[PDB]
Ligand binder design. Structure first.
Ligand SMILES: [Cl-]
Ligand SMILES: [Cl-]
Ligand SMILES: [Cl-]
Ligand SMILES: [Cl-]
Lengths: 133, 133
């Protein structure tokens, strides 16, 4: 009914990573949470169908850029992600963005220390994608 | 419970596609169903946690083959698939295979005519992957 517990989870996770809660923002008690990052798209976190979803919107690359970076991107996408409901991080393409998305299993969203590791790994996947875009 | 309703769904779908229910095989009433195809991996279909999953196992390509085919595989994986729970067909490393996998939304597994289109599109994606491996 509210994002209050998700906000607290993210906050708790950031104490463990070593970042301040000043980078965490939201619109209201029902919106997605945003973690602003330097030189990278923000990490968005929200409850979608009672499941925690993390996503990042990268500016969509041209077809030719995707071609020169395809091997690197494919290898990234084939990497298992243990906390995901399907064991993977997903890539969704729209006209404007190439979006990295993952839906986390309920087993891992009730412990800020574990969620810190999830955020850290998602950030690492984002770093790899950012480096080849 | 059992794969009886799923077997009936699959065989019904095949009549609509123009194939016989002879290409449909299974081990018993609790196993996955397998549709044998000529010159391509079989299509596997099973109920996994009350959800219908389709998957096909392709022999995993070497690293050098992946380098040349990465762009085509990536383009394929970014294609929307409307019947999937995440709007995509998934690609997983699975033992010695590259596996195409999709979990179908419950909305589309009670009508053999609709499921026929699902099988047809999954087969089309398999054809695309097969052509670059
Ligand atoms: Cl939560
Ligand atoms: Cl982070
Ligand atoms: Cl069913
Ligand atoms: Cl078919």
């Amino acid at each position: 009914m509210s994002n209050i517990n998700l906000v607290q989870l993210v906050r708790d996770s950031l104490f463990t990573i070593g970042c301040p809660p000043s980078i965490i923002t939201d619109l209201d008690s029902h919106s997605a949470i945003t973690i602003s990052l330097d030189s990278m798209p923000a990490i968005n976190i929200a409850l979608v169908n009672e499941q925690v979803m993390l996503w990042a919107n990268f500016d969509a690359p041209s077809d030719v850029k995707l071609q020169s970076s395809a091997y690197n991107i494919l290898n990234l996408m084939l990497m298992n992600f243990s906390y995901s409901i399907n064991e993977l991080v997903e890539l969704h393409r729209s006209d404007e963005y190439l979006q990295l998305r993952v839906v986390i299993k309920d087993d891992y969203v009730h412990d800020g220390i574990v969620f810190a590791e999830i955020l850290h790994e998602f950030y690492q996947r984002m770093e790899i994608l950012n480096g080849v875009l």
